[PDB]
Design a protein around this ligand. Sequence first.
Ligand code: MFU
Ligand code: MFU
Ligand code: MFU
Ligand code: MFU
Ligand code: MFU
Lengths: 89, 89
Amino acid sequence: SVQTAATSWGTVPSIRVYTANNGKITERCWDGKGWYTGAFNEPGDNVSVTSWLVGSAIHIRVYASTGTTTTEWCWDGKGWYKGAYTSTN
Amino acid sequence: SVQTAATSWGTVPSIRVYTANNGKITERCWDGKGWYTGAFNEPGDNVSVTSWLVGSAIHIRVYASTGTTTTEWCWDGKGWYKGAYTSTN
Ligand SMILES: CO[C@@H]1O[C@@H](C)[C@@H](O)[C@@H](O)[C@@H]1O
Ligand SMILES: CO[C@@H]1O[C@@H](C)[C@@H](O)[C@@H](O)[C@@H]1O
Ligand SMILES: CO[C@@H]1O[C@@H](C)[C@@H](O)[C@@H](O)[C@@H]1O
Ligand SMILES: CO[C@@H]1O[C@@H](C)[C@@H](O)[C@@H](O)[C@@H]1O
Ligand SMILES: CO[C@@H]1O[C@@H](C)[C@@H](O)[C@@H](O)[C@@H]1O
């Protein structure tokens, strides 16, 4: 079966839902109207997510894994880009 | 594939990333500098987390499962400890 993770913020719930389907991740978004498709689209067999606010600004971090390789895609208000997360230190 | 869970708190932020790989879970932490390895080391090929703040003090609960057995692990400001959680009534 597919794998999903979810996060959310505000009183006016915005909710993001990430679905790992067949090695591909699709983001679903809701801002109080209808659900819609977001800009997130990255490879991976499993997902986790978190989010925080700095005032009314959301930051999201998505943790996408395939095999033993975990990648982080960062959302800070502008665009998705590759984060500096690594597994070993 | 590996399975990750993640949580965070604050506006810095702090981020905890737990990974289930080969029946073992290992914690990865970030508090504004680089990523680093956490104190958490528990068996489980599936993980979930949640964290809550009391003022500025973080509390974290990790849900570590193998087979049908779920063990809770707590961080409350000192050391990790085995939670009182049970999955049945
Ligand atoms: C108002 O609509 C209900 O709550 C929203 C926050 C969403 O979770 C939506 O799918 C649900 O049907
Ligand atoms: C404004 O853009 C929408 O919301 C952001 C918080 C992200 O979830 C992004 O992928 C989405 O398309
Ligand atoms: C500032 O660096 C970016 O944001 C941090 C909160 C982390 O998620 C890090 O891995 C990422 O590269
Ligand atoms: C202070 O210790 C660090 O942060 C705590 C909140 C825990 O995540 C712990 O495992 C980690 O080593
Ligand atoms: C006080 O009890 C501890 O903290 C609670 C919030 C629960 O996580 C419980 O299972 C745990 O043993």
